[PDB]
A paper describes a structure:
Glutamate dehydrogenases (GDHs) are ubiquitous oligomeric enzymes that catalyze the reversible oxidative deamination of l-glutamate to 2-oxoglutarate, at the crossroad between the Krebs cycle and ammonium assimilation. Large glutamate dehydrogenases composed of 180 kDa subunits (L-GDHs180) contain long N- and C-terminal segments flanking the catalytic core. Here we show that the mycobacterial L-GDH180 (mL-GDH180) adopts a quaternary structure that is radically different from that of related low molecular weight enzymes. Intersubunit contacts in mL-GDH180 involve a C-terminal domain that we propose as a new fold and a flexible N-terminal segment comprising ACT-like and PAS-type domains that could act as metabolic sensors for allosteric regulation.
The domains comprised in the 1–500 region of the protein are stabilized by crystal contacts in the crystallographic structure. Notably, the primary structures of ACT and PAS domains are poorly conserved and, therefore, these modules are often difficult to identify from BLAST searches. The C-terminal region consists of a single helical domain that showed no detectable structural similarity to previously characterized proteins in Dali17, ECOD18, CATH19, and VAST20 searches and, therefore, constitutes a possible new fold. Contacts between mL-GDH180 subunits engage the ACT*2, ACT*3, and C-terminal domains. The ACT* domains of mL-GDH180 differ from the archetypal ACT fold in that strand β1 is located in the position usually occupied by strand β4, creating an ACT-like ββαββα topology with a β1β2β4β3 antiparallel sheet. Notably, the interaction between ACT*3 modules in mL-GDH180 produces a continuous eight-stranded antiparallel β-sheet with helices on one side. Close to a dimer-like interface, the PAS module in mL-GDH180 adopts a typical fold, comprising a core five-stranded β-sheet usually involved in signal sensing, and displays up to 12% sequence identity with PAS domains in sensor histidine kinases retrieved in Dali17 searches. Similarly to S-GDHs50, the catalytic core of mL-GDH180 consists of subdomains SDI and SDII, with the active site located in a groove in-between. The SDI in mL-GDH180 contains most of the residues of the glutamate-binding region whereas the SDII conforms the dinucleotide-binding site.
Author numbering:
A (entry chain B): 629 to 1588
B (entry chain A): 1434 to 1588
C-alpha cells in the first residue's frame, strides 16, 4: 500500500502539472500494464532505498532497462504517453522521505515529499523552477517552487485545490520581481487542506477548528518540506543531507518563509516547527512573528514608499517636509502602512480617505491640527474613522459610513474633490470611485487589492472581485502623484497608462520594497548572529538585546537602499526619451537569452516600441523600473556564476551590509558567512545599477564586446579610482538641499558619460581580464592627485567652457568645488591617457597634463569632441561610428602627445612645447593645421567632415 | 590578369597592370625596409601576408566605393584610404619588431598574434564581424579602420 501511495502522489503531482489524461484513465493505464507497473516500482526502489547503497551495485541498469523495454512494448498511444510521463517523473525526482524513520519527521505522520527537478519534466508548463518540492497527504497537499538556491517568497494558504501549482507558478514571477534588490531570488509555496472538519453550525467553534485544522495542515506541509531539506551545522560548517534520504542533487539548505493571504499569524508556528527539526535558521526561518522586527513600529515600508513620493514631488518641484500638500489615502490609522505614512509630514492635509468601514471627508484640512488628530488616532491600539474628532473636521466635512444607503455631499466636500457642480448626495461606491479620481496632489495607498485598472484590461482579468465595483481606470486617475505602499494596487498596464497620462508613479515592488527588504536584512543578521552565538561570542540572552539595539540602524540601511533606488528612478525617468532605442535592444536580449516574456512583464511590443520612437519618448517610469529590475536579476545571475564574489577587491564591501555594532564586534563571523557570495553579488549589482545606470553594463558589452563579468570589473575599478560614489553622494546632497532635480540630474548625466568613457578606456587599453586591484593601485592614487588641479593647464576654449559649466551649476545653489569637479569630468577622463602616457615615458604626470591640455587648446579639440557627441545613436552601427570617431580622436591625441613629449625639455611648458614641435614639423603638419582651421571655419558637423578633420589630426604623426 | 588576357592582352602586361594597387603598396614596403635597414623582399612578404589574413583588399575596394560627389566626401574617402594605408604601415612596423627574418609572413603573423593583447583579439573578432555584415557606408568602414588602428601601441 506504500508503493501505491507513491504512485498516487505522483499522479497528483501530474494533475497539478496539467496532464491531459484524467486520474481514471491514469489508473486504468497502470492497471492494464501490471508488469510495467512492477518495473516502475522496482526502478524507484532501486533509486531511493538507502539499503540499496548497502546492497552493492545499485540495481540501476536492471530496473531502468525493465522500464524501458516495457515502454517499448506499449502500442496504445495514451498508455505510451502516460508511462513515459511516469518514467520522466521517476527520473526527475531528486530527493525523497520515503525512507526516513525518525519519529519527528513528517513521513511518520503519513506525509510524502518529493524534491524534483522541474527542468527535466516533459509535461510541466513553463516556467520550470530550479527546484520544486511536492508534498502529498490525504489531509494536506502542497507545493513549493524555488527558482534558486537562495530564495524567498510568501506561503499562500490557497483555496484552489484543483490547481494550486498554477496559482504558485503565477505568483512566482511577481515574487521574484519583488526580490530584485534583495539577496535571494524568487520562491513561492502553497498548501491546500483536503479534509476540512465537519461544521457544527456554531459560527464560532467552526471557525476555531477551521483555523486549527489549517494550523495542523500548515504544520504538516512544512514538516514534509523539512524531511528532505538539508540542514546547516556550524559545528563543522558543512551541509548535512537528511539520514535515510538518498540525494540525487547536490546540497541545498537555504529556505525562509514569508506570510501571505493565509499565513499572516503562522510565522510563530513556523518558527516552532523549524526548531523541532533543529533547523539552523531558527527565528530567521519566518520573517518576524516573535523575534525580529515590529514592522508597525519601524514603519519601514511607509518610509521606503515615502522616498519615492518625495522623489516624485521633487521632480514636481515640491518638498513634502516643509510645504502643505493634499492627500487622498486608502486605509486607517490602525494599519501599519497608512498609519506610519500619514504622520511623515506635519504639512499633510488629508482631504479625503475611505476604508473598509468608514469614509472621512475633511474639505479644508489643517496641517498642525490634522497631524495631531492623525497622531492621536495612530497611538490607539485600534480605532476607525469614526474616532476622528468631528470638531477637528473641517466645516462641511464629517465621518460617514460605507454601509449607508447614501452620504450627503457638502459644498466644501464637492469643490475640493472637483465633480459636477450639481451633486448634493452620492452613493458610497460612487464616493469611493470619485475619491479614486481626484484633483489631489498625492494619492497614498495603504490597502490591498487592485483599485486602478487599465482602460484595456478586463475587470475579470485583474483578479479582484471585491473592488471590481469601485475600480477606476489609470488614464482616469486625476491624482498628480501616486504612492504605492500596498501591493497589487495598480495593474502594470494601469501603471503604464497613468505614467502616459502625465502622472508620477513607480512600480509597487520598488515602493513597498522596504518591508520585504527588512525581511531579508533581518534574515541575514539572524544568520550572522546565530553563527557568532555558536562561536561563543554572543551569549544567547544578549542576542535579543543586540537585535533590538540595532533596529534603527537596520532601518536606516534599508531606507538608504530605497533612496538610492529612488534617485536612480528619477534619473532614469530623466533620460528615457533619448535611450529608447538602446532600451529596446536590451529588451530583445532578455527575451532571446533570459527567457523573458514581453507581454507578461508589461514590456512594450516592438510595434509599441517604435510607436513611441515615432513619438520621441522613451520608456514609462513603471516600465523603466521593470527593466532595471530584470537588469538587476540578470546581473546577479552573471556575477554569481563567476568568481567575482570570490576575489577580495569585490569582497571588501561585505562588512557594510551589517550595523555598526556588528561591523565592529563581528568581523571574523562576517568574513565566513554562509551567504557571502550572494550578499557580495547583490551589493555589487545594487551599487552598479544605482550608480552606473540602466544601460551602462549592456552598452559596455555592446561597445567593448565583453561579457558582463568584464563590465563589472571595469565599473568597480572606475568607481574606486575616481571616487564616483563620493561624487554621487555630493550631487545627491546638493539635490536634497533644495537644488532642483534638473541640475542634479544633469550633473549626474555628465558624470555617467564620464564613467562610460572611462570604463570603456580601461577595458580597451589594458589587458583582459581586469585585475581590479592592480589597475586601482596604478591609477586611482594618480587620479586623486590630478583631479583637484584641473585649473592649472586648461587653456582658451577649454578654460572658458569649463568655467561656464561650473558657474551655471553654482547659479542654482550647487557648491562651487562640486560644480567645478563635475564640470571637468570629460577632462578627468583624459587624465587616464595622461597617466598612461606619463607611465610610458617615466616622467611626471604634472608636465604631461600640461602638454596634453595645452595641445587640446591650440587645435580646439573640445568643439570636435562635442560635435562627435552630436552624431546620431539611432541604431547600433551609427552609435558604433560615433564611438569610433571619439576613440580615434582620443587615440590620435595619445600619439600626438607622444611625439610632442619626444621633443623639448620638461621645463618647457605646454605652449613652448607646442611652439617648438610645430617649429620642427614637416609640410604635412602645416598643411594639416591649415585644413583643420578651415574645417573649424565651415561649421559642418556630419560624419564626413568630422572624419576628415580626424584624418588631418592623424596624419600629424609619423607612426600612422 | 586572366580577364585582361582573355581579350588578347599579353600575359606579362596583363599581370603587371592587374597588380598596380599592390605596386603602390611597394612604396610603403620600400620606406619600411629603409627604416628597419632590412631587405625589401622579407618586408614585402610580411606586408602582403598581413594584407591577406585580414582581407584588406575588400576594405580598400569598399573605401573606393565611397562617393566623390562633392569635395568633402571625396576628402572623406581619401581620408579613410590613407588611414588604412598608414595603419598598414604601423602594424607592419610592429610585426617586423617581432620574430626573425627567416620567419615568413604567416609565421611572423602567427607569433605576433601569439604575442598580442586582449585588445588585438577583440579587434580581430570585431573586424571579422564587420566583414560578415557587408555594410559599406562611411560609418562601418570607419569603425573597421579604428579596429585596425587600435592594434598598435603607437596610437
Amino acid at each position: 500500500w506504500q508503493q501505491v501511495v507513491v504512485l498516487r502522489a505522483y499522479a497528483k503531482y501530474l494533475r497539478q502539472a496539467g496532464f491531459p489524461y484524467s486520474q481514471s484513465h491514469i489508473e486504468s493505464v497502470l492497471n492494464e500494464n501490471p508488469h510495467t507497473t512492477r518495473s516502475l516500482i522496482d526502478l524507484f526502489e532501486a533509486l531511493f532505498d538507502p539499503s540499496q547503497e548497502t546492497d552493492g551495485r545499485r540495481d540501476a541498469q536492471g530496473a531502468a532497462a525493465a522500464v524501458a523495454a516495457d515502454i517499448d512494448a506499449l502500442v496504445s498511444l495514451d498508455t505510451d504517453r502516460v508511462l513515459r510521463a511516469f518514467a520522466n517523473l521517476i527520473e526527475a525526482t531528486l530527493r525523497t522521505n520515503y525512507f526516513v524513520a525518525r519519529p519527528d519527521s513528517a513521513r511518520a505522520r503519513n506525509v510524502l515529499a518529493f524534491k524534483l527537478n522541474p527542468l527535466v519534466i516533459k509535461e510541466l508548463p513553463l516556467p520550470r523552477p530550479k527546484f520544486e518540492i511536492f508534498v502529498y497527504s490525504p489531509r494536506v497537499e502542497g507545493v513549493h517552487l524555488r527558482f534558486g538556491f537562495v530564495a524567498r517568497g510568501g506561503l499562500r494558504w490557497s483555496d484552489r485545490r484543483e490547481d494550486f501549482r498554477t496559482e504558485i507558478l503565477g505568483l512566482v514571477k511577481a515574487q521574484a520581481v519583488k526580490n530584485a534588490v534583495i539577496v535571494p531570488v524568487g520562491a513561492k509555496g502553497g498548501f491546500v487542506v483536503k479534509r476540512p472538519p465537519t461544521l457544527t453550525g456554531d459560527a464560532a467553534a467552526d471557525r476555531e477548528a477551521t483555523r486549527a485544522e489549517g494550523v495542523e495542515c500548515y504544520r504538516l506541509f512544512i514538516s514534509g518540506l523539512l524531511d528532505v531539506t538539508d540542514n546547516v551545522d556550524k559545528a563543522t560548517g558543512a551541509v548535512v543531507t537528511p539520514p535515510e534520504v538518498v540525494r540525487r542533487d547536490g546540497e541545498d539548505a537555504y529556505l525562509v518563509v514569508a506570510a501571505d493571504k493565509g499565513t499572516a499569524t503562522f510565522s510563530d508556528i513556523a518558527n516552532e516547527v523549524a526548531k523541532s527539526y533543529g533547523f539552523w535558521l531558527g527565528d530567521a526561518f519566518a520573517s518576524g512573528g516573535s523575534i525580529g522586527y515590529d514592522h508597525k513600529a519601524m514603519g519601514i515600508t511607509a518610509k521606503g514608499a515615502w522616498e519615492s513620493v518625495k522623489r516624485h514631488f521633487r521632480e514636481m518641484g515640491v518638498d513634502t517636509q516643509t510645504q502643505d500638500f493634499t492627500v487622498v489615502g486608502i486605509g486607517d490609522m490602525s494599519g501599519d502602512v497608512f498609519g506610519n505614512g500619514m504622520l511623515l509630514s506635519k504639512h499633510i492635509r488629508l482631504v479625503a480617505a475611505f476604508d473598509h468601514r468608514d469614509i472621512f471627508l475633511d474639505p479644508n484640512p489643517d496641517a498642525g491640527r490634522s497631524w495631531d488628530e492623525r497622531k492621536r488616532l495612530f497611538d490607539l491600539p485600534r480605532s476607525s474613522w469614526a474616532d476622528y474628532d468631528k470638531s477637528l473636521i473641517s466645516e462641511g466635512g464629517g465621518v460617514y459610513s460605507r454601509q449607508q444607503k447614501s452620504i450627503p455631499i457638502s459644498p466644501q466636500v464637492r469643490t475640493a474633490l472637483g465633480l459636477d457642480a450639481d451633486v448634493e448626495e452620492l452613493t458610497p461606491p460612487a464616493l469611493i470611485k470619485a475619491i479614486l479620481k481626484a484633483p489631489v496632489d498625492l494619492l497614498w495607498n495603504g490597502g490591498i487589492g487592485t483599485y486602478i485598472k487599465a482602460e484595456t484590461e478586463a475587470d475579470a482579468d485583474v483578479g479582484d472581485r471585491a473592488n471590481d465595483q469601485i475600480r477606476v481606470c489609470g488614464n482616469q486617475v486625476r491624482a498628480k502623484v501616486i504612492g504605492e505602499g500596498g501591493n497589487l494596487g495598480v495593474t502594470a498596464l494601469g501603471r503604464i497608462e497613468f505614467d502616459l497620462a502625465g502622472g508620477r508613479i513607480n512600480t509597487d515592488a520598488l515602493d513597498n520594497s522596504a518591508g520585504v527588504d527588512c525581511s531579508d536584512h533581518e534574515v541575514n543578521i539572524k544568520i550572522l548572529i546565530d553563527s557568532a552565538v555558536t562561536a561563543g561570542k554572543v551569549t544567547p540572552e544578549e542576542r535579543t538585546e543586540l537585535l533590538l539595539s540595532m533596529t534603527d540602524e537596520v532601518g536606516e540601511l534599508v531606507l538608504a537602499d530605497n533612496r538610492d533606488q529612488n534617485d536612480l528612478m528619477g534619473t532614469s525617468r530623466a533620460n528615457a526619451a533619448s535611450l529608447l532605442s538602446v532600451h529596446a535592444r536590451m529588451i530583445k536580449d532578455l527575451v532571446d537569452n533570459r527567457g523573458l516574456n514581453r507581454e507578461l512583464e508589461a514590456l512594450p511590443s516592438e510595434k509599441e516600441i517604435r510607436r513611441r520612437a515615432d513619438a520621441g519618448i522613451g520608456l514609462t517610469s513603471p516600465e523603466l523600473a521593470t527593466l532595471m529590475a530584470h537588469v538587476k536579476l540578470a546581473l546577479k545571475d552573471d556575477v554569481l556564476a563567476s568568481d567575482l564574489p570570490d576575489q577580495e577587491v569585490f569582497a571588501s564591501r561585505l562588512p557594510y551590509y551589517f550595523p555598526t555594532r556588528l561591523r565592529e564586534e563581528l568581523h571574523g563571523e562576517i568574513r565566513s558567512h554562509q551567504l557571502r557570495r550572494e550578499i557580495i553579488t547583490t551589493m555589487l549589482v545594487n551599487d552598479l545599477v544605482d550608480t552606473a545606470g540602466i544601460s551602462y553594463a549592456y552598452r559596455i558589452t555592446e561597445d567593448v564586446g565583453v561579457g558582463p563579468v568584464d563590465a563589472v570589473r571595469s565599473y568597480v575599478a572606475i568607481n574606486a579610482i575616481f571616487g564616483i560614489g563620493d561624487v554621487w553622494r555630493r550631487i545627491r546632497a546638493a539635490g536634497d538641499a533644495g537644488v532642483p532635480t534638473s541640475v542634479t540630474d544633469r550633473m549626474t548625466l555628465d558624470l555617467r558619460r564620464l564613467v562610460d568613457r572611462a570604463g570603456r578606456w580601461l577595458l580597451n587599453y589594458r589587458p583582459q581580464p581586469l585585475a581590479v586591484g592592480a589597475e586601482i593601485n596604478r591609477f586611482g592614487a594618480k587620479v586623486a592627485a590630478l583631479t583637484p588641479r584641473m585649473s592649472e593647464w586648461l587653456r582658451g576654449d577649454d578654460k572658458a567652457i569649463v568655467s561656464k559649466e561650473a558657474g551655471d551649476f553654482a547659479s542654482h545653489g550647487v557648491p562651487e568645488d562640486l560644480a567645478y569637479h563635475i564640470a571637468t569630468g570629460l577632462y578627468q577622463y583624459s587624465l587616464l591617457d595622461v597617466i598612461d602616457i606619463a607611465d610610458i615615458v617615466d616622467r611626471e604626470p604634472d608636465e604631461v597634463a600640461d602638454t596634453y591640455f595645452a595641445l587640446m587648446d591650440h587645435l580646439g579639440a573640445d568643439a570636435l569632441l562635442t560635435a562627435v557627441s552630436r552624431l546620431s545613436r539611432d541604431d547600433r552601427w551609427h552609435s558604433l561610428a560615433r564611438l569610433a570617431i571619439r576613440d580615434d580622436i582620443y587615440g590620435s591625441l595619445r600619439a600626438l602627445c607622444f611625439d610632442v613629449l619626444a621633443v623639448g625639455e620638461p621645463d618647457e611648458n605646454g605652449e613652448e612645447k607646442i611652439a617648438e614641435w610645430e617649429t620642427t614639423n614637416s609640410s604635412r603638419v602645416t598643411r594639416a593645421r591649415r585644413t583643420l582651421t578651415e574645417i573649424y571655419k565651415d561649421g559642418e558637423q556630419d560624419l564626413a567632415t568630422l572624419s576628415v578633420a580626424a584624418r588631418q589630426i592623424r596624419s600629424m604623426t609619423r607612426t600612422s
